Symmetry: C3
Subunit: 83 residues, 3 copies
């Protein structure tokens, strides 16, 4: 539940956002976010998910499915952000 606990590189959600960054759908994230094996806070993840949701129409159907699932997973932080 804690918004500044971590999401780890071995998790589905980390790998999802990292792959959406590979795709250019996630862009504009703080430099070094995907560097090495550093965790990402749920709050930072949610910002990346919110931006992907705004760039949603450019995703393939599989990526749209990833965004949909991420949006559920981070709904509490997304609501905090006004999304």
């Amino acid at each position: 539940a804690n918004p500044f606990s971590d999401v780890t590189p071995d998790s589905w959600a980390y790998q999802a956002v990292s792959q959406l960054a590979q795709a250019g759908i996630v862009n504009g994230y703080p430099d070094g976010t995907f560097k090495g094996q550093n965790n990402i806070t749920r709050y930072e993840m949610a910002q990346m998910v919110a931006k992907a949701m705004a760039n949603q129409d450019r995703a393939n159907a599989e990526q749209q499915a990833m965004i949909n699932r991420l949006a559920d997973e981070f709904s509490n932080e997304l609501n905090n952000l006004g999304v």
Copy 2:
């Protein structure tokens, strides 16, 4: 407007925050932000505006007027941020 939708370089607000960065009033933003002509999210723009409203003592009369206009234009995200 979604808080993580994009503000484009043609918008008054984009150009104003870029000018405030050149002047030093907006500082401490992500590197990359004003290099070239890439979009900035409303949420990041709002963080830059909040910073300038904190730094508004540095501003000349015309810059203070710009900042006031910006705080209006991003009032929704500024309210989310607690500004």
Copy 3:
């Protein structure tokens, strides 16, 4: 304003400095603690919130530092959902 500054003179800046050195605070921008630059209350609060998320790493006085930071940045932490 959550984006008003915290200076390097401040107890709070130095405490998060110390906790980052201790490894309790991580994942902050690279230029955060260098060049004697101020930190916004917003970025301070994010680091404090990681310190709370990791508070089981801290000893008694580091916990006391975390507790004091959590009070100091309570408004920003609330806005962040913490």
